[PDB]
Amino acid sequence: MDYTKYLAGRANWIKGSALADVMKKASELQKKGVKLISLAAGDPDPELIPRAVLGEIAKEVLEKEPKSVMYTPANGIPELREELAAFLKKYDHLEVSPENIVITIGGTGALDLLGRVLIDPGDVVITENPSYINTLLAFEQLGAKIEGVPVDNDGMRVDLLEEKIKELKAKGQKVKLIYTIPTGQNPMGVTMSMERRKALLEIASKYDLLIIEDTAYNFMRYEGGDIVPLKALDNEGRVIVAGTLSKVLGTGFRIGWIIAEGEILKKVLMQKQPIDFCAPAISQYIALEYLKRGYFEKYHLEGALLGYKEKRDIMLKALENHLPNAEFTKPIAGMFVMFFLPEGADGISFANELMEREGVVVVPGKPFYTDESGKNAIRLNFSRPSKEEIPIGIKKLAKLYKEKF
Amino acid sequence: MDYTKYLAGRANWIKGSALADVMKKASELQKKGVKLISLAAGDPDPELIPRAVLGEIAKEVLEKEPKSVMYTPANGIPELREELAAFLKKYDHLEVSPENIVITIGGTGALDLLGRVLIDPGDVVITENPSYINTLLAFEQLGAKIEGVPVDNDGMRVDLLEEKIKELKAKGQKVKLIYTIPTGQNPMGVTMSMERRKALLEIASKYDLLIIEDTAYNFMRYEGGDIVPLKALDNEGRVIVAGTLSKVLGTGFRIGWIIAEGEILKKVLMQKQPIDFCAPAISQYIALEYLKRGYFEKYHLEGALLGYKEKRDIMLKALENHLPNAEFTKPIAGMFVMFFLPEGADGISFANELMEREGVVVVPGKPFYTDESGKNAIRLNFSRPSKEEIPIGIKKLAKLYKEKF
Amino acid sequence: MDYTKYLAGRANWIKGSALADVMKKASELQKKGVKLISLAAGDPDPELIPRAVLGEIAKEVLEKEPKSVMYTPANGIPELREELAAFLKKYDHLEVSPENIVITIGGTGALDLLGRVLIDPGDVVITENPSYINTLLAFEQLGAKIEGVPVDNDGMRVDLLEEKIKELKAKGQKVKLIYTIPTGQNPMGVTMSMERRKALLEIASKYDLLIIEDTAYNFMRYEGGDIVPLKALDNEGRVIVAGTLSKVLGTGFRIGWIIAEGEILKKVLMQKQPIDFCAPAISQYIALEYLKRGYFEKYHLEGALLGYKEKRDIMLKALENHLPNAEFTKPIAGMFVMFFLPEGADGISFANELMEREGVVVVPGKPFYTDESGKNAIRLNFSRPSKEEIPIGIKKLAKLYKEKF
Amino acid sequence: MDYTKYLAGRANWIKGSALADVMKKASELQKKGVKLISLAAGDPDPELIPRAVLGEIAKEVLEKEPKSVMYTPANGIPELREELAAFLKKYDHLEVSPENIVITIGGTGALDLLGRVLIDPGDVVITENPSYINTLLAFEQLGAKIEGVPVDNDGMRVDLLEEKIKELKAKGQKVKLIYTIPTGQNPMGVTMSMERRKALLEIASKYDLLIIEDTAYNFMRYEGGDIVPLKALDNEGRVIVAGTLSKVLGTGFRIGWIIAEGEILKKVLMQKQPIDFCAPAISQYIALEYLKRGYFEKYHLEGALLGYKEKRDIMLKALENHLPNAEFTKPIAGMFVMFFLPEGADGISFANELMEREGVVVVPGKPFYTDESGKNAIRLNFSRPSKEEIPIGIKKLAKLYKEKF
Numbered sequence A, B, C, D: 001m002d003y004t005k006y007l008a009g010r011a012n013w014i015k016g017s018a019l020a021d022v023m024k025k026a027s028e029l030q031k032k033g034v035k036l037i038s039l040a041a042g043d044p045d046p047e048l049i050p051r052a053v054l055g056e057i058a059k060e061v062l063e064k065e066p067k068s069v070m071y072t073p074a075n076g077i078p079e080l081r082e083e084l085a086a087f088l089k090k091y092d093h094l095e096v097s098p099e100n101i102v103i104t105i106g107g108t109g110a111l112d113l114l115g116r117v118l119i120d121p122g123d124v125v126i127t128e129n130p131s132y133i134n135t136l137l138a139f140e141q142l143g144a145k146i147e148g149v150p151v152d153n154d155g156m157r158v159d160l161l162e163e164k165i166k167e168l169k170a171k172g173q174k175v176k177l178i179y180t181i182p183t184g185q186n187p188m189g190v191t192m193s194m195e196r197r198k199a200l201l202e203i204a205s206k207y208d209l210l211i212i213e214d215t216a217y218n219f220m221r222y223e224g225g226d227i228v229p230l231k232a233l234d235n236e237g238r239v240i241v242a243g244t245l246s247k248v249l250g251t252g253f254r255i256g257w258i259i260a261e262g263e264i265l266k267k268v269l270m271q272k273q274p275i276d277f278c279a280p281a282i283s284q285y286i287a288l289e290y291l292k293r294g295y296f297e298k299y300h301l302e303g304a305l306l307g308y309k310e311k312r313d314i315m316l317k318a319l320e321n322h323l324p325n326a327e328f329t330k331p332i333a334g335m336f337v338m339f340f341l342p343e344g345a346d347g348i349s350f351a352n353e354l355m356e357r358e359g360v361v362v363v364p365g366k367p368f369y370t371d372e373s374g375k376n377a378i379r380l381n382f383s384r385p386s387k388e389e390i391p392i393g394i395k396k397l398a399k400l401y402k403e404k405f
């Protein structure tokens, strides 16, 4: 039977993910024989995460708290919101009310809920170029048109942002939202400077726009001085945040959040129960305890954080020993490094050869771009690989490198 | 600042509930701490659930499985889908391939993913009248127009279903989907007969329609014979199921699924990673073990199920005892009883008056209807309250009843 | 074949118009023998229009101007726009650039073009209650939600308008446009007072809303003072007008216009060629010469106008002496009088009986309301019927009335 | 003020048109002194049209028929529908009922009315490549996704059509309509062979698709045998036609039609009054007399048609004589000829340089393609320019051609 006839026309806005084509082409070789170390993942290190400790909490809460197995309010258990509030004020410089927090199915869920309430099909949403592949996909399947703005070692080029806004309006285009990942961007790995952050806020006010700040990697900072979220600088209330504990507490727990105000918060809350009903009860209680027991500092700060900072150094050391000639980013936050093949080279076919020949998995990155740029780009992860995997990983990458240029 | 201006016009399709307005007046009475018995809730008894056991497996999973903290595939871990296929084939008379099942954020998430792929704004979707408010709400905020078909003690009046289709088509109206809750429907509590289930499939085939079957309460059947889901008789492949373990495993785990095929499955999977990324890793693993070691039959079939059946009889005897001259449903499945005030009576204010004067919380019901009927309806839940609360619950309900009627 | 399955879901937003249903029930009576006296349709008197003259200029234009048979720019021939600009300056307080004028397929097309550029599905658009049925229908098939505001002898109640707006925003509803017919409204026949017009402009500014002014009957005024359009008072550029020459030159020529600015004008014009290509060349050239030769004064102002004014006096005169106990409107402009049956009486039912038992055609009216009110309303037209037919008509109308009430 | 913020998101789907942009850049040249030879716009020759004749009928109609200045039923006066039905049966092998004919504002309005009832945002609509730009623009601003299918001198490559269809379905894409211009296509000027017309009908039936047949040039055929419209072969009723008399009676009268059945016809009719109200009364009556008096035979068949055929031969003679090494279409019908510059050559700049240096106007070509093809295309029209102007225009064109290549 042809089910294609029953699809909604908006289903044609839904398309495949390149980061999924290779993550499957590898899943085929990883189970059907071959052994491979990947630099393509986006997960945090499960070994750096206190699993046994989380198992203990999971075990206690399930037998201790009956609610751990039942529905939770649409915006999350009050205690998690009260704790997340204090947590943000403590470690991310955020003075936010618990009533303004909405616990979602991870940042992904937060970005989706927001798009549903803020996007009308055709609306143009401007983003960094490149940007997080999944947010672009999320927004386009909602009918949005994406317009990207170039980035550099200091993040989005705020000067190019204003020009894009003007070029768009000069065409009579309707623009409303700006989507940005200020700290440790996926996939570039760069972070917006404080100078560009204040300039961004000025531009949002100037053109009367709203900003959606993605803080997924705010707690993965290693070098930064005292860089604060745009939200902490938001005196006009033009920014909305989409956060997550996935890179901390674990990426499978599905715990994230939205910080918004006024009628936007209201509509977000209103539409939620019929969409996901509520964020997972165990996850919320596990997170509530993790925070209350002060395990953030005890395990993530003075623990997993250093573990990531290290893998970052070794991957860069490895790159700066074997590929000192090539161009790549120097992240002071996040969990990715964007490597660049010679200008012109194909990044998707090269990513294939690394598997088809050297047995190492890397993400093309090309699909992370909002236009024709980024062909020769390649994203590399260092948060999942072991200390040993990384050197061999990029060494094999360096093997095929000169083996072609 | 007026955020109203930044909203997307489709955000106007988002509206309040009733199972929210009453739950806010109850929390307002509980905030300023006042005792109250609840018959409104839709949760399974957390005490009839083997929390302790789940906790141990939660501890096991997190301790020994690193993947229980990371991203699972968008459609779920292969082992869970393979187990579900077996669990369904054994307890729900359904034969399905693991490749055709997708683990979602409960039945809710399943219904939403399905709405997003099958609904274009303006599409009419046919449902039972009354039906589950959250699905009505979920589909309407996607822009669908709801057309209801009356139900009786044998479920949806299938004959009137064809009548509605004929009426709609006579007007030139486009319809493609029928959403039905065959067993232990929420809020009516009635279950479609096998006779009507066979006719429904024929009507869907005659008008080339697709059916969305909500199996949420298929495992909460008491004094029932041998009923099988529409999907088991679906020889043309016209039905899609939206199931869940919410009532079995726990309503907070967020574990549900979609069973679709062909291009509909493809599109559903393709859009999932950018929406929820994946169902909770823990939950997925907690459910995997739970099923693999036969705890469904050990704790639910011969433990929880019997507890619910018992609470069912107590509420009915209580109703039959105190309000013999009033009308209400006699469920053979599910967790609710629909009570009817005198024809003409306002159930919404009655519920408020019952909570303000007697301290018992019940759900209006009118909001579950698709047209102007059901004004005198009141939904009653018996799966969460205690055996002691029930009698006292409907007792007080009867006092205000005879007080006015 | 069942074409229902091919329809776009938005086609479901398209619905029937009683003002064209019973109007088609009369089209059957005429072409079937029955001698009918019509007080329905809103056509101008074809005998008060210089048909012969127009016939002469039509001949001329066709033989002397080769363009009268070919396409024209999407926004209309420059000469007509320039001629309309001056015309509007001399008779309607308007100082507009010919560049800001777009020649459309009557005001109908003007309203549809604006809806397409300003309305996202779900958007709330505020209108008067009652309001012009075709415009409500036009906006809703574009997915808008209509919210009406009661009118009186002085037009829209501006005080209730601000309450509705505060009401909407309190619910978190998004609103943006206000559609008003300030002079000689269809169907009430009332005109907004200069006092309320200034207040409306204040509210639009206060809430940052746009106003679309329908000027259809600005040239069928009979006794106001220097009442000026909202657009001539629009110092903030918040109003857009949708005008037409159909009530002057002839309702069948399809000559109307949109007056807008900036990006709205840009987009309105960008989308036009692909939907209508251009307004009728022959009609544009006929209108041009009609204007250039001073026929507006010679025939409309000093001919048609007076005839219509006479027809109005006659209808009100007849309504006053044979039906003095009924309440109805007294228009100072336009071509309609809204007549009212006793509260509770059914106007739709009354309309069918009148036609069936007396051969007089009137328009129900209820269809023009935005809510449940207006059941007893009946709209009467005095522009088309001869001055001999008018008294005979309402005389019969009075008879059915009195024997019923 | 920034009106961009008030735009509907869907306003962003509206974009510029080279065809409209070039026509306006030429009208400015005509007024700005310069006198040029035009081979662009798709207008009929105003001298080959019996203007003088149409003039007296226009005068006659206006003075004798009062209905010629008033509204008409949304679908057009009954007499016209009946005459068109007879006209189609005689000169276009079409047996259609007068009830299935809807008089629209030209072929453009017909196509817009159909898109609104048949397209949901995101729907894929397949067309020829290239195709008429206004239809592509019309469907895309309605949110449609266009997929073109290559054509040759025998029209659409039906074999490539089925491969495209299989390509779309394999990706899970939803498609339902196919828009085609079988005879004398704009811009290619080629006509589908009867062999492909039957194959197209088979494919539509095989995949259950609807076909919208554009018959704009069915009456400007010169050498085809007895080619019949797909609609005359539509035994399953899968084709809907969008026709017009613009190329016969005159392109500026705005007299076109839709031929559909069942629910599609019902909905196209229900929505029509609120978008255009009705086609121009004068144009309808003028067309009614034109047909009834047999002027199609007397002035078009034995007049205009032979005149156009001559211009058709003259342009081909001039081209083959001065550009014998360039490839260009040889139309057997229509009014356009697609000229091709050498592969790689930019057609839009060439058109500007031609208009600037030689003062001859042509259309860029590239805008009519659904993909990146056509860069070197240039559309040439032979219906409007005089017998004399054509050779001069093509010579000047040849001059710049070899001056560049």
Ligand SMILES: Cc1ncc(COP(=O)(O)O)c(CN)c1O
Binding pocket: A042, A105, A106, A107, A108, A109, A132, A181, A186, A214, A216, A243, A244, A245, A246, A247, A251, A254, A255, A256, B276, B277
């Ligand atoms: C920029 C960004 N935003 C949001 C997310 C979502 O994070 P999550 O759905 O695991 O809570 C990620 C991780 N893939 C990310 O990199």
Ligand SMILES: Cc1ncc(COP(=O)(O)O)c(CN)c1O
Binding pocket: A276, A277, B042, B105, B106, B107, B108, B109, B132, B181, B186, B214, B216, B243, B244, B245, B246, B247, B251, B255, B256
């Ligand atoms: C009809 C119906 N369907 C599905 C569900 C599932 O809800 P979920 O798997 O998100 O706990 C429920 C529970 N409220 C329900 O009543």
Ligand SMILES: Cc1ncc(COP(=O)(O)O)c(CN)c1O
Binding pocket: C042, C105, C106, C107, C108, C109, C132, C181, C185, C186, C214, C216, C243, C244, C245, C246, C247, C251, C254, C255, C256, D276, D277
């Ligand atoms: C208020 C109003 N607006 C617009 C119109 C449309 O006028 P037009 O004959 O130029 O399409 C009418 C009459 N049908 C009207 O009454």
Ligand SMILES: Cc1ncc(COP(=O)(O)O)c(CN)c1O
Binding pocket: C276, C277, D042, D105, D106, D107, D108, D109, D132, D181, D185, D186, D214, D216, D243, D244, D245, D246, D247, D251, D252, D254, D255, D256
């Ligand atoms: C293929 C095609 N279809 C439809 C039309 C519309 O013709 P019209 O709006 O003058 O009745 C044209 C000419 N603009 C055309 O080339």
Ligand SMILES: [Zn+2]
Binding pocket: A136, A140, A146, A370
């Ligand atoms: Zn994109």
Ligand SMILES: [Zn+2]
Binding pocket: B136, B140, B146, B370
């Ligand atoms: Zn509803």
Ligand SMILES: [Zn+2]
Binding pocket: C136, C140, C146, C370
């Ligand atoms: Zn309405």
Ligand SMILES: [Zn+2]
Binding pocket: D136, D140, D146, D370
């Ligand atoms: Zn295109």
